[PDB]
Design a protein around this ligand. Structure first.
Ligand SMILES: CC(C)n1c2c(c3c1-c1c(Br)c(Br)c(Br)c(Br)c1C3=O)C(=O)CCC2
Ligand SMILES: CC(C)n1c2c(c3c1-c1c(Br)c(Br)c(Br)c(Br)c1C3=O)C(=O)CCC2
Lengths: 328, 328
């Protein structure tokens, strides 16, 4: 019969009511800046798609971050540029300041506002209960904004959340995997990092939506309150779904694949098995108990659902009791 | 009430005093040459509307430039051909030598005189004050001629000015966006590159005229005397008008839209803000001061006005003190 279709329960048609130019990024024309305006100071890191440098805008002596792209389809570059320009000025969205043409790689280089990030492997160990609530709220601001603008990030994870902790400042970065949501569109399921892939990606259900990001957020939250980073630590995609099922239980998983008539890859047969849904109390211990509370567990439970349609929206999440004190 | 109409203050009726055939390009019949007269030597570049090749005319062994056109309405090809033929032989106008059509693919190719251009990214950094005055004067010759022939270029920018610096030769090229001026005609505002769009284009005032080109010229001049390319560096069309208003001030802008009863797009409301008119001295520094003079600033100020009717004409511009030494 084929899989049952699905639609986002919020922001479903926002791109259809936009002018064509907003989401038809293949027709976007890039206006290049002057690359001699920037001198590279030092390398900050390397990724699958890019190399990242701290640089100086010599016209005004301002610090910037330059992401020199590795070779990829021009269509994906246009997509990332168009999404960054659509989202510019939104709450906690990284600001694209310029686009130049690297003299060495002859590839594009994206210039971004600078952020003085504290590395998460050292930050998350020091975060208090209130810090986790605060930064979760900031991330939710960014996510609700981009979802309301018809865009899903599809790569939410700690490495893509820059935090200047001294100033309580947060930026959601790396939009190279983001896409425009259109109702009925089938998307590539090979997105996001393995530890943060939603079950819809792991069972190969292509008609997903904004709710994918929410699953990733839950994973992050799980790793923060239980002090286990990453929380679902699978060795591959199959073992990733297995690790998830050992916590969430197999009954809801099979109900999920039955509801959407999903054809389960045969390889799962001999590895999913039968697993009960566990209570979160089994992950609590003396070193993490100060971060775990009834409110946090209720919120986490409402994020980590197999059925993408049953997960909280970003706005619903922002209205949860877990955040009352942050809301002031 | 609607917008207040406008007319060019010079060359207003030149096309109406012409035979219909001069400006009625929709009825133009193309005189085709033989495509086998030309052999392509090498590719020189790629554009939005065309690909550009160096080629050899084998009947007379002469070097030429071939612009193979991408798919476009036949009426626009007729327009470009008719304008090129009307302007052929004019001062510093590129010469159209032939028009051919691949007998198999049926795609059209325009053949042009060859010019040994030095790319502006390397030329403009080496230009002296006198060089800038000289080449501005040459561009003004071309512009006054085409305006006097009832034609506005609508795409003036460095990429469309070919300069053979060894021979002090200059050609204004790429007339694919040019149009005939008719009093009372409303034109498409989606013309020119972002950084060179006049305010009339950005506020959607359709009854513009030759003076549009003058705004573009001012932009070029600014970037050359201040060594700042582009001068108005907007992120999009809206932010482009914002960049302009941060230099020329918002008060003259609102006086402009009041004079012509222009309906401002509501989105400008939250981005234009309040800005004072800046003095040009803020763009002068140790690396460009040898190119900036009182005469240059006076001329520039008289080019970059919101009100298109208050900008210098090409001839008035040619009579400015900035050019006395060039006039000899
Ligand atoms: C972890 C760090 C080295 N980093 C990486 C990336 C990016 C960064 C980074 C930092 Br730090 C800052 Br601050 C800003 Br602002 C911006 Br934008 C970025 C960015 O895009 C990748 O895209 C992949 C490789 C890792
Ligand atoms: C920058 C260069 C490669 N170039 C481009 C174009 C054109 C040229 C060019 C050159 Br050089 C010369 Br010499 C002559 Br003569 C003429 Br006519 C042209 C011309 O029309 C485009 O139209 C768009 C793509 C870039």
């Amino acid at each position: 019969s084929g899989p049952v279709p699905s639609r986002a329960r919020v922001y479903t048609d926002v791109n259809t009511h936009r002018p064509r130019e907003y989401w038809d990024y293949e027709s976007h024309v890039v206006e290049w800046g002057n690359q001699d305006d920037y001198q590279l100071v030092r390398k900050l890191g390397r990724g699958k798609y890019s190399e990242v440098f701290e640089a100086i805008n010599i016209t005004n002596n301002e610090k910037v971050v330059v992401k020199i792209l590795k070779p990829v389809k021009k269509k994906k570059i246009k997509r990332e540029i168009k999404i960054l320009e659509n989202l510019r000025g939104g709450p906690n969205i990284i600001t694209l300041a310029d686009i130049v043409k690297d003299p060495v790689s002859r590839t594009p280089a994206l210039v971004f506002e600078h952020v003085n990030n504290t590395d998460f492997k050292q930050l998350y160990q020091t975060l208090t209960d209130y810090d986790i609530r605060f930064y979760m709220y900031e991330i939710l601001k960014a996510l609700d904004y981009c979802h309301s603008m018809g865009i899903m990030h599809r790569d939410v994870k700690p490495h893509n959340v820059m935090i200047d902790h001294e100033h309580r400042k947060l930026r959601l970065i790396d939009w190279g995997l983001a896409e425009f949501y259109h109702p009925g569109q089938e998307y590539n399921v090979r997105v996001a990092s393995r530890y943060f892939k939603g079950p819809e990606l792991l069972v190969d259900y292509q008609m997903y939506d904004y709710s994918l990001d929410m699953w990733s957020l839950g994973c992050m939250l799980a790793s923060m309150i239980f002090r286990k980073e990453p929380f679902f630590h699978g060795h591959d995609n199959y073992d990733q779904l297995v690790r998830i099922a050992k916590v969430l239980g197999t009954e809801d998983l099979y109900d999920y694949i039955d509801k959407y008539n999903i054809e389960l890859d045969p390889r799962f047969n001999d590895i999913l098995g039968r697993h009960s849904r566990k209570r979160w109390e089994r992950f609590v211990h003396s070193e993490n108990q100060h971060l775990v509370s009834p409110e946090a567990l209720d919120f986490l439970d409402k994020l980590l659902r197999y059925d993408h349609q049953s997960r909280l929206t970003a706005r619903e999440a922002m209205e949860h009791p877990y955040f009352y004190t942050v809301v002031k």
